[PDB]
């Protein structure tokens, strides 16, 4: 019996059973080759590559699994890979996946369970400080012009507060610096930064304990990507999704708990006072820019542990569609739907289209609910923007687009139609000048707005004026919706006989 | 086969390409014609030729639908459009546009009168009391249309009182009763400009016209193109064809009609005698439940087994996008060259329902102007939105020369990643609005008819000044060609099926 949500290796096996994984046995260079193969597979929605013979590898360190949450063909279920991180039927839609995650918020949180070390495959091999050699690993060089090799693209950073009440799991990119050090972005408003600032506040900025875990339970890596509330430990919600506690063991060199079935675990201390230049790194909007960036904190690795024949999962970001659109975007959408429900807005669904590179959040609006409020477009846009852009859930989003409930927001052909035909350029767009800008957006990073970090965000009204007051019946001029059902069925029936 | 010159040769070349289905079973012109057309358009399928319409006579008529719809890439996807011009069927939309511009530099060839005996449009001739427009199997195209639309891919002919300008153009035309048709006749369209000349000398109620169906395909393409005022479209159609269009006189007035037209209607137009028109399903995808001039039909002439060509507008992609959009883009490129802007290409993406005009900028030419985003956006908007060529266009989008503007994947990528919402958009408040845009028609801007247009800057600030090298993070552009080729070569050996 396979349990893909609880075991990374069972997740591999079910993708094999669905012919959605290719074991590549010939020699592949971690320098560019891995990365280009991944981009080709993401962009035509093809099977996930599993590289078994990397140039420079040892028997144990490591294989690479690329594209762990890319899209695949509609026949097998196109979001199948996502659905298997949650233990759901491979044909489940992304609307359904979202509404499942919201149901699991109502279930009892189950905290992790400690198990004996001999039951943790992550403890099979252990390396102390003098045996750590990060430059000897077959780490990938993923994009032309990247500043280094990125070991950490699909692992889980684990940090805990000084008072021990909140342990955080999240994903952020991590670059190998030298034989013992990794560096990466630690920016507001992310929780990794909030926890580090709390270590600085009690005098320990140069010695923050961390763990970095690869090939965790798939449900854990997906909740690592999700912006749940401050103070809530990811592990307890992951337990609710699994229906059982995640099994964990303690680190060798600190008090943190790591999943027992991890492929690889790195441990150490993070310093906010000892910094290094990071990047460049190809990013979720499709670009490598040569900008040297701010200097970033340094992670010092002091121990590692791993399984026999260990597998590193990898994400290679860029043009749609990859994990930075299917996870970051759809998990912002999950929490955006939750926020509409708690603040009383009449939203049926939310979604971040892949074609818009996770910059556009579409809200599908219930028209009876909207009419009950007896409001105007100007007041509704302000209320919505104030809810979303002044909170952490809104951070990556630069344009919020409001459409009526006759639009399938999960179909980008319906969304681009409503966008160009139902909003007046400029006049139907409300600017928010004083809110936090998203620094990765290229129109921000490559402007003066990078110095100031405020504004450039908008709410765009694609709801007709009459739709705020009452019913408004119009015909949509295509085959499926423009003609009555009986005629559609008759044309579909006689299609062959006509001569097609 | 000369498909640019003969409508029946166009139908045959489509037969030879398996791009035409002769439908022989009985089909109702009430909704069924329309629905079949929509299904064909939307999956880029072969054009339906309806041979046995309920209510038809032997001669009046069949319907060809989807004459400038898209087809499979294997056959050439703009093949139908290339055939209107006599070009190879795999010619790209880029090459089609550039061909139309090269044809502006050839010598115009005015029409040539031929004998009435050699002219098929004269095979059958009806006099005034033999006109019965309600006995034609005219299509009822969209649910909630305000009536039956006979004129959707025919050619209106109007001439100035001095005889020096003959205009050919397309505009929708709805049957009102047994003798009368009504259509939109609006500024700034040449048909309104010419009608107003007749009103100015006291003949607003008796303007001669003709209406022709199944014209030479090159003529129906130019009829949809905004060429300059006072140029008779016939003369440029001649330059395109490499010969004069062959024409014959109308029975009841002095206008000349193409000799091979399937059907010709003749009469007088009145601007002061109005009737309710519409609603009609339109180029942006809607019928809304929301008073135009009257055309009096006084004579008709037609071929044996005549064929009415039909366009049914709606969602992308149909003739309102492949012709109206691309021919605005053709004239938009001509205006850039004439005004001196650094534009390599222009296109109106079909996905944006012909509301978006994308302009591909040459960065060395832009850098040579020593300008800013604010000043360039003003310069571009002032050229386009204040002239007839910019009439349908509500957003102009400026991109650099690394974007293929003919591929909508790269357009939407550039759009969302390279402009700051609002701050990088310049509103034009005092220019004329397109009254068909749904955001205009369903707001109080329907009554003012000004504003709601903008130029959106999608060129990075540094690209106005100098080189700017970044990597595009996909497979074919992100990696060296050698490595791209190596991966493609070994793809099957890895295990991909
Ligand atoms: C799935 C995923 C999420 C990335 C991500 C990537 C992936 C594959 C990469 C590694 C390919 C590239 C860039 N990533 C970063 C990122 N957030 C961040 O602060 N820095 C990052 O470097 N994220 C988002 C981050 O995981 C979410 O915002 C979480 O909500 C953070 O958790 P938190 O709410 O506990 O802070
Ligand atoms: C190809 C095509 C073009 C339509 C058109 C359609 C098609 C199929 C229809 C019939 C399906 C629906 C609506 N159309 C109208 C329209 N222009 C207009 O003034 N009224 C219209 O009703 N046009 C565009 C018109 O032909 C262009 O604006 C020309 O440039 C007009 O020529 P002009 O420069 O000589 O005035
Ligand atoms: K998280
Ligand atoms: Mn968190
Ligand atoms: Mn004209
Ligand atoms: Mn014309």
Author numbering:
A (entry chain C): 3 to 502
B (entry chain D): 4 to 293, 297 to 503
Q: What text appears in the publication on this structure?
A:
The UbiD superfamily is composed of a wide variety of (de)carboxylases acting on aromatic, hetero-aromatic, and unsaturated aliphatic acids. Prenylated FMN consists of an FMN molecule modified by the addition of a fourth non-aromatic ring joined via N5–C1′ and C6–C3′ linkages between the flavin and prenyl moieties. Following binding of prFMNreduced and formation of holo-UbiD, the cofactor undergoes oxidation to form the catalytically relevant oxidized prFMN species. In the UbiD enzyme family, Arg173, Glu277, and Glu282 (A. niger Fdc1 numbering) form a conserved ionic network.
The corresponding six variants were also made in the related S. cerevisiae Fdc1, with the corresponding UV-visible spectra, decarboxylation assays (of cinnamic acid), and crystal structures revealing trends similar to those observed for the A. niger variants. As observed for A. niger Fdc1, the R175A mutant (S. cerevisiae numbering) shows a prominent 550-nm peak, indicating the presence of prFMNradical; however, this feature is absent in the R175K variant. Activity cannot be detected for R175A, which is consistent with the presence of prFMNradical indicated by the UV-visible spectrum. Crystallization of wildtype, E285D, and R175A S. cerevisiae Fdc1 variants confirms cofactor incorporation. The crystal structure of the R175A variant again shows prFMN in an unmodified form; here disruption of the ERE hydrogen bonding network has resulted in residue Glu285 moving away from the active site to within hydrogen-bonding distance (2.7 Å) of residue His287.
